[PDB]
Amino acid sequence: MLKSELRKKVLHKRINLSEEERRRLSEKVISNLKSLPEFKKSKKVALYCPIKGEVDLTPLFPEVLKEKELILPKVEGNEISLYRVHSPACLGVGAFGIMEPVEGERVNPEDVDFIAVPGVAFDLEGYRLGFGKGYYDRLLKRVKGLKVGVAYSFQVFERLPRDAWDIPVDVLVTEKNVRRLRDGRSLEHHHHHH
Template structure:
């Protein structure tokens, strides 16, 4: 995929996401959260990776409160360190601060190796039916995803799921796509 094609898709979907009516955005986000909770109950993970929503991503913040109350799992979030994402366990939202890219991230704490993550919820501007994603282009998740041995779940709104995204050799697909409408295992 050329850089101009990626830029065009990013721009289109980012604008569409940001232009959602506030009430519709809240409604769709709540349905995404419900599907995330249902998926977590099905999988019963011990270590879960979430992301802090930005730029019109589904508002999954209610998951934080729910998962932080559970003693049977560890909630982790990414933190930008140098040109990579490191993962840290959090015990409360007070363990977060605004990071390098104006995204809430862990202040410090117990570092979690990516191989320890059982279930990773992954953001993206677009996903395709084979699980490939298009992000903001910084490459953070491109470097992180190959190191995660647990199941990877692309989280987005259904209009962000495209039939196919051209991909680069380093792209790692997610195992599932989760939207407000469904949770689907990707085709291989």
């Protein structure tokens, strides 16, 4: 398929973005995400990790720690558990360069209200192209709350070639616009025949 190449060609420019523009757009995403009234209610705020060409949500940790529970993915053994932190105490590099909370309060991923998950590419329906399947998709099967896709409009298209069963998100936040994938169509009471 074009799955691997499409990931690559977008990722190449994705990591080419300069911190100048990037950091300013990240600020917009931060402000947008933090201004969302549902983020005010969501108690468990889990983030994936900005590493390659995602959004600088890293500096937002202090804000999160102040109000809600900052939840980060901890790899205990292939399967990922989620640990909540209320302080910048336990954050150590355990995995491939990323920091994870090895000591703290073990929370089950299904308890997470709000989670921010980035992707190489997004579309206008809420699909991704994935990264690498194996164990991380299992974590995605755990977290069935509000999955918010966080990325830049550059990595967003109208539609993507859906490979198999990549997990669609609930909300999509960019640096320019707010995308909601929970629009309703019609409502019936007793319209199912008379």
